Design a protein around this nucleic acid. Sequence first.
RNA 1: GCCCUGAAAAAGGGC
Length: 26
Amino acid sequence: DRGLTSRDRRRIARWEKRIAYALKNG
RNA sequence: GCCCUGAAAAAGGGC
């Protein structure tokens, strides 16, 4: 079993999926 | 329960 859920792993991914937006949008 | 897509602090979708 894993202590992280579909939200954990994806939670950090946003770190690279959000920057592009929050960064490309100024 | 696990993800994927959404930027999402929506909305969605697959199994």
